[PDB]
Amino acid sequence: MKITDLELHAVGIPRHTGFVNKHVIVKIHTDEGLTGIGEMSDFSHLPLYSVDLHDLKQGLLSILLGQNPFDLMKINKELTDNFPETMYYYEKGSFIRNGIDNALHDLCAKYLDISVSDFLGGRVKEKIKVCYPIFRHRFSEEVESNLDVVRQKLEQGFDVFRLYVGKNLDADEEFLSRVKEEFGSRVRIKSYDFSHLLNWKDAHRAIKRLTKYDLGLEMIESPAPRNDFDGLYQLRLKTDYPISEHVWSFKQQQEMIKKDAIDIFNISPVFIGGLTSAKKAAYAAEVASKDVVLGTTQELSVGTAAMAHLGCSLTNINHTSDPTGPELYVGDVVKNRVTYKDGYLYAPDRSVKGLGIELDESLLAKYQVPDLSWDNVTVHQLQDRTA
Amino acid sequence: MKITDLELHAVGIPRHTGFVNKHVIVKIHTDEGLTGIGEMSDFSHLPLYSVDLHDLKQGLLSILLGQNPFDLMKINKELTDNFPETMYYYEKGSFIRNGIDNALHDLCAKYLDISVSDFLGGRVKEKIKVCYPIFRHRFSEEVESNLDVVRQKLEQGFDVFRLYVGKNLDADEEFLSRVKEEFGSRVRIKSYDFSHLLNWKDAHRAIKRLTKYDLGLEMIESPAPRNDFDGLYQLRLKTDYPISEHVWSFKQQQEMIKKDAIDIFNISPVFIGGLTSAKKAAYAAEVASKDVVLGTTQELSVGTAAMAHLGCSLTNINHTSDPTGPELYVGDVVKNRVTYKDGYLYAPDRSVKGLGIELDESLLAKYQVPDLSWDNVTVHQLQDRTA
Amino acid sequence: MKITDLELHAVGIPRHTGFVNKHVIVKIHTDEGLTGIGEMSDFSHLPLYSVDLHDLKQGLLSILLGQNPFDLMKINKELTDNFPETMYYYEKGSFIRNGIDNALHDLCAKYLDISVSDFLGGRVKEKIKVCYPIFRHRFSEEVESNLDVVRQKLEQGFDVFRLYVGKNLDADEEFLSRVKEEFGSRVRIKSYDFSHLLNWKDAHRAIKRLTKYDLGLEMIESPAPRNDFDGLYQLRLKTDYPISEHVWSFKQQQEMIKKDAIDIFNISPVFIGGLTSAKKAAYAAEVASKDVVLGTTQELSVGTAAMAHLGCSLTNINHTSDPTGPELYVGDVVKNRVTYKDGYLYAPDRSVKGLGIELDESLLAKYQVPDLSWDNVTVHQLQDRTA
Amino acid sequence: MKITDLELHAVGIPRHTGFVNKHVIVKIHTDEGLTGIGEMSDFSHLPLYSVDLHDLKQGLLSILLGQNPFDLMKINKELTDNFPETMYYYEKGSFIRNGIDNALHDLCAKYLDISVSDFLGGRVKEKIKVCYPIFRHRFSEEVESNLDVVRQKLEQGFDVFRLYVGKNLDADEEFLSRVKEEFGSRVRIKSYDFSHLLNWKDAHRAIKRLTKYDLGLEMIESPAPRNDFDGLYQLRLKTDYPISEHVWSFKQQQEMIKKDAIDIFNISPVFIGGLTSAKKAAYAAEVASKDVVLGTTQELSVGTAAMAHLGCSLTNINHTSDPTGPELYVGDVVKNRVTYKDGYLYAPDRSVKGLGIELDESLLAKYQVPDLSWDNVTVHQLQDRTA
Ligand SMILES: [Mg+2]
Ligand SMILES: [Mg+2]
Ligand SMILES: [Mg+2]
Ligand SMILES: [Mg+2]
Complete DSSP assignment for C137-164? PSSGGGHHHHHHHHHHHHHHT--EEEEE
| Amino acid identity at A211 | T
CA separation for the pair C344, C135 (Å, rounded): 20
Cβ-based contacts of C258 with chain D (< 8 Å) = 257-258, 260
Q: Which residues does residue D164 pair with via DSSP β-bridges, in sequence order?
A: D193
Whether the CB of A167 is below 8 Å from some CB of chain D: the reply is: no
Whether the CB of C260 is below 8 Å from some CB of chain D: the reply is: yes
Quick one: how many helices (H) and strands (E) in chain A? 14, 12
CA separation for the pair C295, C253 (Å, rounded): 15
Selection from D89, D73, D75 nearest residue D6 by Cα: D75
Given a contact cutoff of 8 angstroms between Cβ atoms, the answer to whether B282 and A285 are in contact is no
Q: How many residues does chain C have?
A: 387
> Is C164 tagged catalytic?
yes
Ligand nearest to the CA of C133: 3
φ/ψ (deg, to 5) at D193? -105, 120
Per DSSP, B357 falls in state: -
Query: In a 10 Å sphere around its CB, with 0-12 CB exposed, 13-18 middle and 19+ buried, how is residue A226 labelled?
Result: buried
CA of A308 to the centre of ligand 1 (A): 17
| Amino acid identity at B143 | V
Minimal Cβ distance to A205: which of D236, D237, D240: D240
Provide the 10 A C-beta neighbour count for residue B46.
12
Cis ω on the peptide bond leading into residue B223 (within 30° of 0)?
no
Chains touching chain A, criterion 3+ CB pairs below 8 Å:
B, C, D
DSSP β-ladder status, D20-30 and A344-346: unpaired
CA separation for the pair A356, A303 (Å, rounded): 11
CA separation for the pair A382, A43 (Å, rounded): 11
CA separation for the pair A283, B287 (Å, rounded): 9
In sequence order, the 6+-apart residues with CB closer than 8 A to the CB of D152 are none
Whether the CB of B112 is below 8 Å from some CB of chain C: the reply is: no
In sequence order, the 6+-apart residues with CB closer than 8 A to the CB of B155 are none
Provide the 10 A C-beta neighbour count for residue D383.
18
Cis ω on the peptide bond leading into residue B69 (within 30° of 0)?
no
CA separation for the pair B296, B269 (Å, rounded): 8
Cβ–Cβ gap C121/D276 under 8 Å: yes
Active-site hit among D88, D132, D164, D340: D164
Query: In a 10 Å sphere around its CB, with 0-12 CB exposed, 13-18 middle and 19+ buried, how is residue A7 labelled?
Result: middle
Angle among Cα D150, D151, D157 to the nearest 5 degrees reads 85
Q: Which residues does residue A163 pair with via DSSP β-bridges, in sequence order?
A: A134, A192
Given a contact cutoff of 8 angstroms between Cβ atoms, the answer to whether A56 and A43 are in contact is no
Q: Which residues does residue C220 pair with via DSSP β-bridges, in sequence order?
A: C192, C243
φ/ψ (deg, to 5) at C273? 105, 10
Which H or E element spans position D252?
Answer: helix D250-258
Distance from CA of D81 to the nearest CA of A (A): 37
**Helix A275-287 vs helix A72-82: crossing angle, to nearest 10:** 100
Q: Please state which architecture CATH assigns to domain C1-122+349-368.
A: 2-Layer Sandwich (3.30)
Distance from CA of B287 to the nearest CA of C (A): 13
Given a contact cutoff of 8 angstroms between Cβ atoms, the answer to whether C135 and C17 are in contact is yes
φ/ψ (deg, to 5) at C323? -65, 105
DSSP β-ladder status, A3-14 and A20-30: antiparallel
Active-site hit among C90, C213, C329, C367: C90
**Is C142 among the annotated ligand-binding positions?**
no
DSSP β-ladder status, C264-267 and D291-294: unpaired
Selection from A297, A42, A377, D263 nearest residue C81 by Cα: A377
Sequential DSSP letters for B278-317: HHHHHHHHHHTT-EEEE--S---HHHHHHHHHHHTT-S-B
Please report the beta strands in chain D, taking only residues with DSSP state E, as ranges in sequence order: 3-14, 20-30, 35-40, 127-129, 132-134, 160-164, 188-193, 219-221, 243-246, 264-267, 291-294, 344-346
Given a contact cutoff of 8 angstroms between Cβ atoms, the answer to whether D354 and D116 are in contact is yes
Probe site for chain A from C76, C87, C381 (most A CB atoms < 10 A): C87
Chains touching chain B, criterion 3+ CB pairs below 8 Å:
A, C
Ligand nearest to the CA of D95: 4
What are the angstrom distances between the C-alpha of A13 and each of A365, A374, D1? 12, 13, 62
Cis ω on the peptide bond leading into residue D223 (within 30° of 0)?
no
Provide the 10 A C-beta neighbour count for residue C211.
15
Cis ω on the peptide bond leading into residue C47 (within 30° of 0)?
yes
CA separation for the pair D296, C34 (Å, rounded): 39
CA separation for the pair B179, B137 (Å, rounded): 14
Q: What is the largest CA-CA distance in chain B?
A: 61
Probe site for chain A from D238, D240, D262, D264 (most A CB atoms < 10 A): D240
Which H or E element spans position B239?
Answer: none
Probe site for chain D from A198, A201, A207 (most D CB atoms < 10 A): A201
Instruction: List, by residue number, the catalytic residues of A.
Output: 90, 164
CA separation for the pair D356, D338 (Å, rounded): 9
Cβ–Cβ gap B240/C205 under 8 Å: yes
Cβ–Cβ gap D283/C283 under 8 Å: yes
3-state secondary structure of C229: helix
| Amino acid identity at C144 | E
Distance between start and end Cα atoms, chain B: 46
* Alpha carbons within 13 A on the beta-carbon side of D312: 24
Whether the CB of C14 is below 8 Å from some CB of chain D: the reply is: no
Cβ–Cβ gap A124/B77 under 8 Å: yes
φ/ψ (deg, to 5) at C67? -75, 150
Ligand nearest to the CA of B23: 2
Q: Which residues does residue C225 pair with via DSSP β-bridges, in sequence order?
A: none
Angle among Cα D344, D346, D352 to the nearest 5 degrees reads 175
Ligand nearest to the CA of B384: 2
Positive or negative, the CA dihedral D272, D278, D281, D285 is: positive
Whether the CB of B281 is below 8 Å from some CB of chain A: the reply is: yes
What are the angstrom distances between the C-alpha of B295 and each of B119, B235, B300, B307? 21, 21, 14, 9
* Alpha carbons within 13 A on the beta-carbon side of C355: 31
CA separation for the pair A266, A193 (Å, rounded): 12
CA separation for the pair A93, B157 (Å, rounded): 45
Sequential DSSP letters for A123-139: -S-SEEEB-EEEPPPSS
| Amino acid identity at C43 | F
Please report the beta strands in chain A, taking only residues with DSSP state E, as ranges in sequence order: 3-14, 20-30, 35-40, 127-129, 132-134, 160-164, 188-193, 219-221, 243-246, 264-267, 291-294, 344-346
CA separation for the pair D54, D66 (Å, rounded): 20
Whether the CB of C286 is below 8 Å from some CB of chain D: the reply is: yes
Query: In a 10 Å sphere around its CB, with 0-12 CB exposed, 13-18 middle and 19+ buried, how is residue A369 labelled?
Result: middle
Cβ–Cβ gap A373/C84 under 8 Å: no
In sequence order, the 6+-apart residues with CB closer than 8 A to the CB of D254 are C257, C287, C288, C289, D284
CA separation for the pair A23, A11 (Å, rounded): 5
CA separation for the pair D358, B255 (Å, rounded): 67
Neighbouring residues of the ion ligand 1, judged by CB less than 5 Å:
A 42, 297-298
φ/ψ (deg, to 5) at C287? -60, -30
Selection from C122, C155, C124, C172 nearest residue C384 by Cα: C172
What are the angstrom distances between the C-alpha of C320 and each of B273, C177, C323, D332? 55, 22, 10, 50
Provide the 10 A C-beta neighbour count for residue A165.
30
CA of B202 to the centre of ligand 2 (A): 25
Given a contact cutoff of 8 angstroms between Cβ atoms, the answer to whether B119 and B111 are in contact is no
Q: Do chains C and B touch (3 or more CB pairs under 8 A)?
A: yes
Minimal Cβ distance to B240: which of C204, C225, C234: C204
Please report the beta strands in D334-387, taking only residues with DSSP state E, as ranges in sequence order: 344-346
Angle among Cα C239, C201, B207 to the nearest 5 degrees reads 100
CA separation for the pair B51, B373 (Å, rounded): 8
Given a contact cutoff of 8 angstroms between Cβ atoms, the answer to whether B270 and B297 are in contact is yes
Selection from D44, D39, D98 nearest residue D303 by Cα: D39
Distance from CA of C234 to the nearest CA of B (A): 9
Selection from C141, C99, C149 nearest residue C333 by Cα: C99
Burial letters D54-87, b for 16+ CB under 10 A, else e:
eebeeebeebbeebbbbbbbbbbbebbeebebee
**D200 Rama sector, left if φ>0, alpha if ψ -120 to 50, beta otherwise:** alpha
Resolution expressed in Å: 2.2
Q: Do chains A and B touch (3 or more CB pairs under 8 A)?
A: yes
Query: In a 10 Å sphere around its CB, with 0-12 CB exposed, 13-18 middle and 19+ buried, how is residue B342 labelled?
Result: exposed
What are the angstrom distances between the C-alpha of D52 and each of A24, A256, D56, D370? 74, 57, 6, 11
Whether the CB of C205 is below 8 Å from some CB of chain B: the reply is: yes
CA separation for the pair D177, D159 (Å, rounded): 17
CA of B98 to the centre of ligand 2 (A): 13
Given a contact cutoff of 8 angstroms between Cβ atoms, the answer to whether C213 and C177 are in contact is yes
Whether the CB of D351 is below 8 Å from some CB of chain C: the reply is: no
Whether the CB of A50 is below 8 Å from some CB of chain C: the reply is: yes
CA separation for the pair B278, B248 (Å, rounded): 10
CA of C50 to the centre of ligand 1 (A): 21
Given a contact cutoff of 8 angstroms between Cβ atoms, the answer to whether B229 and B222 are in contact is no
CA of D42 to the centre of ligand 4 (A): 5
* Alpha carbons within 13 A on the beta-carbon side of A383: 19
CA separation for the pair C109, C118 (Å, rounded): 8
DSSP β-ladder status, B160-164 and B188-193: parallel
> Is C192 tagged catalytic?
no
Given a contact cutoff of 8 angstroms between Cβ atoms, the answer to whether B143 and B169 are in contact is no
Selection from A76, C359, C46, D78 nearest residue B286 by Cα: A76
Selection from D46, D45, D43, D133 nearest residue D96 by Cα: D43
CA separation for the pair C193, C225 (Å, rounded): 12
Active-site hit among C88, C111, C132, C164: C164
Candidates 3.10.180.10, 1.20.120.530, 3.40.50.1820, 3.20.20.120; CATH matching B123-348: 3.20.20.120
Distance of CA C258 to the CA centre of its chain: 25
Alpha helices, DSSP H only, in chain C?
Answer: 53-64, 72-82, 92-112, 143-156, 169-183, 200-210, 229-238, 250-258, 269-272, 275-287, 301-311, 325-328, 361-367, 379-384
Cβ–Cβ gap B242/C204 under 8 Å: no
Distance of CA A175 to the CA centre of its chain: 24
In sequence order, the 6+-apart residues with CB closer than 8 A to the CB of A170 are A140
Selection from B82, B53, B60 nearest residue B373 by Cα: B53
Parse chain B into domains and list their residue ranges. 1-122+349-368, 123-348
Sequential DSSP letters for B47-72: SS----HHHHHHHHHHHHTT--TT-H
What are the angstrom distances between the C-alpha of A107 and each of A103, B76, C308? 6, 26, 53
Per DSSP, C133 falls in state: E
3-state secondary structure of C171: helix
Query: In a 10 Å sphere around its CB, with 0-12 CB exposed, 13-18 middle and 19+ buried, how is residue B66 labelled?
Result: exposed
What are the angstrom distances between the C-alpha of A178 and each of A16, A148, A213? 22, 11, 10
